[PDB]
Design a protein around this ligand. Structure first.
Ligand SMILES: NS(=O)(=O)c1ccc2ncsc2c1
Lengths: 39, 156
């Protein structure tokens, strides 16, 4: 049995930690909603 | 039940202790999350009950109490923020420039950020604070790192 608990407001944070790269990937989506890589 | 707009943790007491299985967004009286977090099961908010209204396994999205309300889209150029809500940890904003998932049916924004599975459903936002999609459905690329699509629904 699942329940929800508030965790905060949805706001943009100025001076947030900036990380992560921008990969351009060739992907496929199946009927089950699963993403996979194409080669 | 609590219906204030904002980000919420999706918890369960079925397993050992209380476990966080995912995250969602409450907007305009509708709770938005990923299908794989709840599997379309009913939700509790205090003494109130939330019933699924719309859902789709292929999109990996579900809405409770009403139709999908989030319609903002990534502009394809600007940095975004993942409002990460990790299990047992405080909400935190992480800024990043999204990459692209190229599919046979068009391109989708993607964020290369690594978090525990129970962070699925955390919103991804634009500079105006609008939810452009949810984090949690993606792929593991060469090296073992995770890349999530920026999954957005359709507002009818
Ligand atoms: N089961 S799943 O493929 O949707 C999944 C797996 C790892 C993970 N890491 C961060 S969010 C997330 C979701």
């Amino acid at each position: 049995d699942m329940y929800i608990e508030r965790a905060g407001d949805i706001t943009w944070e100025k001076d947030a930690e900036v990380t992560g790269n921008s990969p351009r990937l060739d992907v496929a989506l199946d009927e089950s909603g699963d993403f996979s890589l194409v080669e | 039940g609590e219906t204030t707009d904002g980000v919420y943790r999706v918890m369960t007491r079925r397993l050992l202790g209380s476990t966080q299985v995912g995250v969602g967004v409450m907007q305009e009286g509708v709770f938005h999350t990923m299908w794989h977090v709840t599997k379309g099961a009913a939700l509790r908010s205090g003494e109130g009950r939330l019933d699924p209204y719309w859902g789709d396994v292929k999109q990996d999205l579900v809405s409770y109490c009403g139709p999908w309300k989030l319609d903002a889209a990534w502009d394809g150029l600007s940095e975004v923020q993942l409002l990460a809500v990790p299990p047992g940890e405080r909400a935190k904003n992480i800024q990043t420039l999204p990459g692209i998932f190229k599919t046979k049916d068009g391109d989708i924004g993607a964020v290369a950020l690594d978090y525990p599975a129970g962070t699925s459903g955390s919103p991804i936002l634009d500079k105006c604070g609008r939810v452009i999609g949810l984090y949690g459905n993606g792929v593991v690329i060469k090296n073992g790192s995770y890349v999530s699509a920026i999954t957005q629904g359709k507002r009818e």
